[PDB]
């Protein structure tokens, strides 16, 4: 289930610190939402262990390595060595992982939150040997405040119209809070909500009571699958996604007629994957 | 005839976590327990010159030695190369105790696990050593 | 997600040996399909660890205990102590668990298969520290060959009519291979299949209600759920329509139909699943 997955790894002891890699050096650093903090998990069925390969774009063959006989950790050229393999032991109920050396499982990864780096340690009951492993997309998008633009015009955004009118349309970015949305991932459902930042409880919603109409509505409801969405990356892009609805995944968030004028309706529509169903989720500048 | 930094003879063995807890066997494990004034808390320490290492036997069972087993525990057993110990002296009476031999191609040492400095009922284990600063690997040898 | 689940624990190093407990003694023993090898996992969320409590019907308050500082594992009275809590570490490679003591997480359970008991080890790569934890129902039913009798009539059973004939009816117990079913569980589908022992690859399963046998077909998988305060009686519901329950059209006499019918609490939809004598 975890083989070949690209993930972020962050510290249970400090969830704002992430495994960070550059030029053979591994350190702990704030969220970057980029490849410096991404790792590919590579499973070997015989060892029953994983390599943890950096997604560095310059040095393409670097993997998390234990610098035996020291307690230091680095990234080195992958040679399939036993000190390049790790046991991913999931602490159930704690949603966290202890990461032990395959070469020597007496030793596990330890977060030095003051030095901001990693070492190997014997075990204990502290959060310093516990790590959070997460799909990099979820990691990047969860609790991210963004604007959403169609790729047919990146100068325009998806907005709630104002605090009292909850309809959703396409407009020129004006930096207003009605044009920002905070994404939150729900683990019980494996799907996301888009909270408009001009309200406390407003979430992007398919009005399945009115065909294809899309509006913001309160989250005060018990459970409505229409409120929740799957966000899927389009290949080769950093920030481009298709957004499908949980209730019915054949329904994709869609810009009416691929029209790019102010006022144009944002609605759901059968997934065809054309340019009008592709969305840029970005930082606000 | 003293050959080294730690004279031959009988010792009590303590963890730096407690001045009142003393190394002795309980079943096949080693642990630190309340003062007994009994021979099973007394340890004969003998230098082996050919090796530059130490053998440590219990006074109550003088042919048993501090050794280690295949499950990570320190043990009491017959003479074997697992009974050789390389101390490193870090303070008055304070030592780190390494197995003479590299284990899993690392230095391994006596290690006592603690819980906010409490070691009651813990077995003494053999775990990896990296430096002289691991509080869990520091032990006192007191002459008496 | 595992708090309060009742599970069996078996050895990756020997998958025929299960954690067994009687009168404070814990051992490794062959499959019993009973309370002696059943354990309740009790999560303390503040310690991020688990008590493992025996389902012994005679002494109800016993939990897996490390007799620190010794090498010995037993069951003692729950006093909520540190040597009675365990970290359950799922090794994502293997779908096995390492079970580490909360009192000393450097130490983990080690199956001594020769002596048929538990001891302790520091972490290593051996299968002797790996364990398979499974919901007890799954553990008992998976790869179990059984006869399936309705609560109405025990001496009768569900069967495939003949090797040539894939239909399914009710008939008296005659020990025929057409009257016996090997239950196999599929982890991906989280559901069960019933192989008939007359065929190699024939399983219990478009013509409305009727139930037959054949070589996706989500309808051919099923969910067995037990009924409270019984040993071996269960309900069986269909995967493609969980609304459906295994039904005895009548009952009770020979040849009576066995069909699909919407779930009810009635005694014609309760089935005893047993070992064939
Ligand atoms: O419900 C609104 C839909 O509008 C579609 O745009 C039409 C396509 C046909 O699908 O061709 C036009 O005639 C323009 O050439 C449009 O009327 C969009 O493709 C759908 O995504 C949807 O927005
Ligand atoms: O489709 C066959 C069903 O037969 C039902 O038995 C009927 C119940 C009503 O549900 O009452 C009778 O009239 C007898 O008093 C039966 O005709 C069973 O209850 C169902 O389980 C089902 O087998």
mmCIF file of N, CA and C and ligand atoms in Angstrom, chain A residues 212 252-259 264-265 267-270 272 274 276-277, ligand 1:
data_model
loop_
_atom_site.group_PDB
_atom_site.id
_atom_site.type_symbol
_atom_site.label_atom_id
_atom_site.label_comp_id
_atom_site.label_asym_id
_atom_site.label_seq_id
_atom_site.Cartn_x
_atom_site.Cartn_y
_atom_site.Cartn_z
ATOM 1 N N UNK A 212 -26.970 20.904 -11.660
ATOM 2 C CA UNK A 212 -25.516 21.200 -11.693
ATOM 3 C C UNK A 212 -25.055 22.411 -10.868
ATOM 4 N N UNK A 252 -17.431 16.687 -12.005
ATOM 5 C CA UNK A 252 -16.225 17.492 -11.801
ATOM 6 C C UNK A 252 -16.581 18.971 -11.720
ATOM 7 N N UNK A 253 -15.929 19.699 -10.820
ATOM 8 C CA UNK A 253 -16.132 21.136 -10.740
ATOM 9 C C UNK A 253 -15.774 21.712 -12.104
ATOM 10 N N UNK A 254 -16.626 22.592 -12.625
ATOM 11 C CA UNK A 254 -16.537 23.021 -14.028
ATOM 12 C C UNK A 254 -16.897 24.497 -14.239
ATOM 13 N N UNK A 255 -16.140 25.141 -15.131
ATOM 14 C CA UNK A 255 -16.387 26.529 -15.554
ATOM 15 C C UNK A 255 -17.324 26.507 -16.761
ATOM 16 N N UNK A 256 -18.453 27.214 -16.648
ATOM 17 C CA UNK A 256 -19.491 27.204 -17.676
ATOM 18 C C UNK A 256 -18.947 27.595 -19.048
ATOM 19 N N UNK A 257 -19.045 26.657 -19.991
ATOM 20 C CA UNK A 257 -18.706 26.874 -21.401
ATOM 21 C C UNK A 257 -17.262 27.233 -21.683
ATOM 22 N N UNK A 258 -16.385 26.936 -20.726
ATOM 23 C CA UNK A 258 -15.037 27.486 -20.717
ATOM 24 C C UNK A 258 -15.010 28.988 -20.968
ATOM 25 N N UNK A 259 -16.061 29.696 -20.536
ATOM 26 C CA UNK A 259 -16.162 31.152 -20.702
ATOM 27 C C UNK A 259 -15.346 31.816 -19.602
ATOM 28 N N UNK A 264 -19.438 34.581 -15.013
ATOM 29 C CA UNK A 264 -19.536 33.203 -15.498
ATOM 30 C C UNK A 264 -19.741 32.215 -14.346
ATOM 31 N N UNK A 265 -20.719 31.325 -14.488
ATOM 32 C CA UNK A 265 -21.061 30.376 -13.428
ATOM 33 C C UNK A 265 -19.998 29.282 -13.219
ATOM 34 N N UNK A 267 -19.919 25.568 -11.877
ATOM 35 C CA UNK A 267 -20.866 24.499 -11.610
ATOM 36 C C UNK A 267 -20.157 23.166 -11.712
ATOM 37 N N UNK A 268 -20.851 22.085 -11.370
ATOM 38 C CA UNK A 268 -20.325 20.745 -11.637
ATOM 39 C C UNK A 268 -20.816 20.269 -13.003
ATOM 40 N N UNK A 269 -20.076 19.340 -13.584
ATOM 41 C CA UNK A 269 -20.377 18.830 -14.916
ATOM 42 C C UNK A 269 -19.627 17.518 -15.098
ATOM 43 N N UNK A 270 -20.199 16.623 -15.901
ATOM 44 C CA UNK A 270 -19.606 15.312 -16.162
ATOM 45 C C UNK A 270 -18.127 15.423 -16.551
ATOM 46 N N UNK A 272 -15.002 15.270 -18.331
ATOM 47 C CA UNK A 272 -14.330 14.993 -19.609
ATOM 48 C C UNK A 272 -12.818 15.329 -19.594
ATOM 49 N N UNK A 274 -11.334 18.188 -20.025
ATOM 50 C CA UNK A 274 -10.955 19.298 -20.895
ATOM 51 C C UNK A 274 -10.393 20.413 -20.033
ATOM 52 N N UNK A 276 -11.396 23.379 -19.295
ATOM 53 C CA UNK A 276 -12.390 23.986 -18.389
ATOM 54 C C UNK A 276 -12.674 23.212 -17.100
ATOM 55 N N UNK A 277 -12.121 22.008 -16.962
ATOM 56 C CA UNK A 277 -12.230 21.223 -15.725
ATOM 57 C C UNK A 277 -10.879 21.128 -14.994
HETATM 58 O O1 LIG D 1 -23.451 23.114 -18.805
HETATM 59 C C1 LIG D 1 -22.479 24.025 -19.331
HETATM 60 C C2 LIG D 1 -21.476 23.259 -20.185
HETATM 61 O O2 LIG D 1 -21.066 24.051 -21.304
HETATM 62 C C3 LIG D 1 -20.234 23.312 -22.200
HETATM 63 O O3 LIG D 1 -19.781 24.120 -23.270
HETATM 64 C C4 LIG D 1 -20.452 23.784 -24.473
HETATM 65 C C5 LIG D 1 -19.634 22.890 -25.399
HETATM 66 C C6 LIG D 1 -20.412 21.587 -25.523
HETATM 67 O O4 LIG D 1 -20.144 20.761 -24.384
HETATM 68 O O5 LIG D 1 -19.572 23.552 -26.663
HETATM 69 C C7 LIG D 1 -20.165 24.856 -26.609
HETATM 70 O O6 LIG D 1 -21.286 24.917 -27.499
HETATM 71 C C8 LIG D 1 -19.126 25.892 -27.021
HETATM 72 O O7 LIG D 1 -18.455 25.449 -28.206
HETATM 73 C C9 LIG D 1 -20.633 25.092 -25.180
HETATM 74 O O8 LIG D 1 -22.015 25.463 -25.173
HETATM 75 C C10 LIG D 1 -18.944 22.959 -21.508
HETATM 76 O O9 LIG D 1 -18.128 22.181 -22.392
HETATM 77 C C11 LIG D 1 -19.215 22.163 -20.239
HETATM 78 O O10 LIG D 1 -17.998 22.010 -19.501
HETATM 79 C C12 LIG D 1 -20.252 22.863 -19.368
HETATM 80 O O11 LIG D 1 -19.672 24.034 -18.782
#
